[PDB]
Amino acid sequence: STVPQIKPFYFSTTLQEKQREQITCLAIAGDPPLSFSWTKDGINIDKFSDIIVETPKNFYSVLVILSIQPNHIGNYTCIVKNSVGSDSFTASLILK
Amino acid sequence: STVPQIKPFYFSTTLQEKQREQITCLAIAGDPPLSFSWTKDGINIDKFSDIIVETPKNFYSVLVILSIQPNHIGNYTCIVKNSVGSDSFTASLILK
Ligand SMILES: *[C@@H]1O[C@H](CO)[C@@H](O)[C@H](O)[C@H]1NC(C)=O
Ligand SMILES: *[C@@H]1O[C@H](CO)[C@@H](O)[C@H](O)[C@H]1NC(C)=O
């Protein structure tokens, strides 16, 4: 009865290489079952083997990078879907 | 030789009752092993039956609220520790 709704997530503004990073695509509202999916620059997050993606609970999914390095720059987009609707959010990983 | 450093976390600005919430205390920098602790309004998070606290990986801790109620208002503090230093961050939960 409730359309999914994603809490905004961000990468660190002071990101430096070899640091660790985590973002959570949290569905603050939305009736389960919910389907989470990730893309980086329009590419399936599959193709980036340095990135770990999990769905530990049925209402959020987590993206983790153990050692940030130049190839991780891009726009990371998460999409959540259910019976009644969808939602999406994008965050940009930048390296100064 | 690297002291812990927490990546900032925030609760939703548009929080409403019975919604779900998650915050991650990520040690963006710091040598393992890392020890995570939580307090709400200075009280051990142990005492709050309706709050789930886990350490899914050894470099970030997760605080999860399945259904938000008025009791959950307060300032939540994470404290990370290792051999050579510690860090702290506080995010406050508001119900408009
Ligand atoms: C996508 O990412 C590129 C580089 O990562 C950035 O310059 C651009 O502003 C982003 N586009 C959108 C629509 O967010
Ligand atoms: C913590 O929240 C209390 C109200 O519960 C308030 O008095 C105090 O100013 C807050 N602390 C900070 C640092 O905002």
Author numbering:
A (entry chain B), B (entry chain A): 0 to 95
From the manuscript:
Crystal structures and cell aggregation assays demonstrated that both α and β subfamilies of sDscam used Ig1 for the isoform-specific trans recognition in a hand-in-hand manner. Furthermore, the cis interactions were established by the three FNIII domains of sDscam, which assemble into a cross fold with a kink between FNIII2 and FNIII3.
The crystal structures of sDscam Ig1 from both M. martensii and L. polyphemus revealed a common assembly of antiparallel homodimer for both α and β subfamilies of sDscam. More interestingly, in some Ig1 crystal structures (M. martensii α1, α7, and L. polyphemus α7), the two protomers within a homodimer were related via a 2-fold symmetry axis, namely, these two protomers had identical conformations. This implied that the homophilic trans interactions of Ig1 were also symmetry-related. Similarly, sDscam Ig1 also employs the ABED face to form an antiparallel homodimer. However, among the seven Ig1 structures reported here, the complementary electrostatic potential surface pattern (negative in one end, neutral in the middle, and positive in the other end) has been only observed in the three β isoforms, but not in any one of the four α isoforms. Moreover, all the Ig1 isoforms without exception have a potential N-linked glycosylation site (NXS/T) located at the F strand. This glycosylation prevents the CFG face from establishing homophilic interactions and helps define the interface of the sDscam homodimer.
